[PDB]
Design a protein around this motif. Structure first.
Motif, PDB file in Angstrom:
ATOM      1  N   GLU A 129       0.853  -1.180   0.000  1.00 28.11           N
ATOM      2  CA  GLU A 129       0.000   0.000   0.000  1.00 28.11           C
ATOM      3  C   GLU A 129       0.885   1.225   0.000  1.00 28.11           C
ATOM      4  OE1 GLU A 129      -3.358   0.284  -0.379  1.00 28.11           O
ATOM      5  OE2 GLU A 129      -4.179   1.271   1.407  1.00 28.11           O
ATOM      6  N   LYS A 130       1.720   1.333   1.029  1.00 29.26           N
ATOM      7  CA  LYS A 130       2.641   2.453   1.177  1.00 29.26           C
ATOM      8  C   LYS A 130       3.584   2.418  -0.018  1.00 29.26           C
ATOM      9  CE  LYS A 130       5.556   4.408   4.917  1.00 29.26           C
ATOM     10  NZ  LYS A 130       4.947   4.679   6.253  1.00 29.26           N
ATOM     11  N   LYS A 131       4.184   1.250  -0.234  1.00 27.20           N
ATOM     12  CA  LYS A 131       5.105   1.041  -1.344  1.00 27.20           C
ATOM     13  C   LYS A 131       4.492   0.051  -2.326  1.00 27.20           C
ATOM     14  CE  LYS A 131       7.517   2.363   2.349  1.00 27.20           C
ATOM     15  NZ  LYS A 131       8.927   2.640   1.940  1.00 27.20           N
ATOM     16  N   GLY A 132       4.879   0.141  -3.594  1.00 28.50           N
ATOM     17  CA  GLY A 132       4.343  -0.769  -4.588  1.00 28.50           C
ATOM     18  C   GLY A 132       4.727  -2.211  -4.316  1.00 28.50           C
ATOM     19  N   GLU A 133       4.026  -3.147  -4.950  1.00 29.77           N
ATOM     20  CA  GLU A 133       4.314  -4.563  -4.763  1.00 29.77           C
ATOM     21  C   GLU A 133       5.691  -4.894  -5.311  1.00 29.77           C
ATOM     22  OE1 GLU A 133       2.408  -7.462  -7.210  1.00 29.77           O
ATOM     23  OE2 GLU A 133       3.634  -6.605  -8.824  1.00 29.77           O
ATOM     24  N   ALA A 134       6.067  -4.237  -6.402  1.00 30.72           N
ATOM     25  CA  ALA A 134       7.377  -4.461  -6.995  1.00 30.72           C
ATOM     26  C   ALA A 134       8.410  -4.271  -5.888  1.00 30.72           C
ATOM     27  CB  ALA A 134       7.619  -3.464  -8.119  1.00 30.72           C
ATOM     28  N   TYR A 135       8.167  -3.276  -5.042  1.00 33.25           N
ATOM     29  CA  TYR A 135       9.051  -2.969  -3.928  1.00 33.25           C
ATOM     30  C   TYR A 135       9.064  -4.110  -2.913  1.00 33.25           C
ATOM     31  CZ  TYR A 135      10.565  -0.667   0.443  1.00 33.25           C
ATOM     32  OH  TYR A 135      11.153  -0.330   1.640  1.00 33.25           O
TER      33      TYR A 135
END
Length: 166
Positions: free
Chosen positions: A48-54
């Motif tokens: 949520e905060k960071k993308g899933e790729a992250y």
């Protein structure tokens, strides 16, 4: 010795991993649990905060860092174990173990990202993913029946490890 456990979320990777590490006198670590503790955020909170790729890149990073240890049992997340790159990395460091459970067991034990029982979600929503991830899991050095109680799966793994790596 490095031992990697792969398979679906409800295959008992975490539990078998602890029992296993205890019988071999080596530490146990679960990637997802380490990823969360490091970010201080829950997995859901993470994409949520960071993308899933992250997140997909984070868990692989965590896997490598954990793999610096020479003796350890590492349980992996559903996706990470289905990640061929991560899987090939694992084989270059140790023994990969696939704790296999049939589709009917998966359906009755697993849940989606929203914690909903898969037995109540539409079938087509997860049948292909289960079939496809399982094809990757099957590339594991060792494959054991995970439908059995955790202690029985441990005996299976030990027996497989014993006749191994000579």
């Amino acid at each position: 010795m490095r031992i990697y456990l792969i398979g679906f979320m409800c295959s008992g990777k975490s539990t078998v991993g602890s029992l296993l590490s205890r019988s071999l006198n080596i530490p146990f670590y679960d990637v997802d649990e380490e990823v969360q503790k490091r970010e201080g955020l829950s997995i859901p909170q993470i994409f949520e905060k960071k993308g899933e790729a992250y997140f997909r890149k984070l868990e692989f990073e965590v896997l490598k860092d954990l793999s610096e240890k020479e003796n350890v049992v590492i349980s992996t997340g559903g996706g990470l174990g289905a990640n061929e790159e991560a899987l090939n990395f694992m084989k270059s460091r140790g023994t990969t173990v696939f704790i296999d459970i049939p589709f009917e067991v998966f359906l009755e034990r697993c849940k989606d990202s929203k914690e909903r029982p898969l037995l109540k979600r539409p079938l087509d929503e997860i049948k292909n993913l289960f079939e496809e991830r399982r094809k990757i899991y099957s590339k594991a050095d060792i494959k054991v029946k995970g439908e059995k109680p955790p202690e029985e799966v441990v005996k299976e793994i030990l027996l497989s490890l014993e006749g191994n790596a000579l």
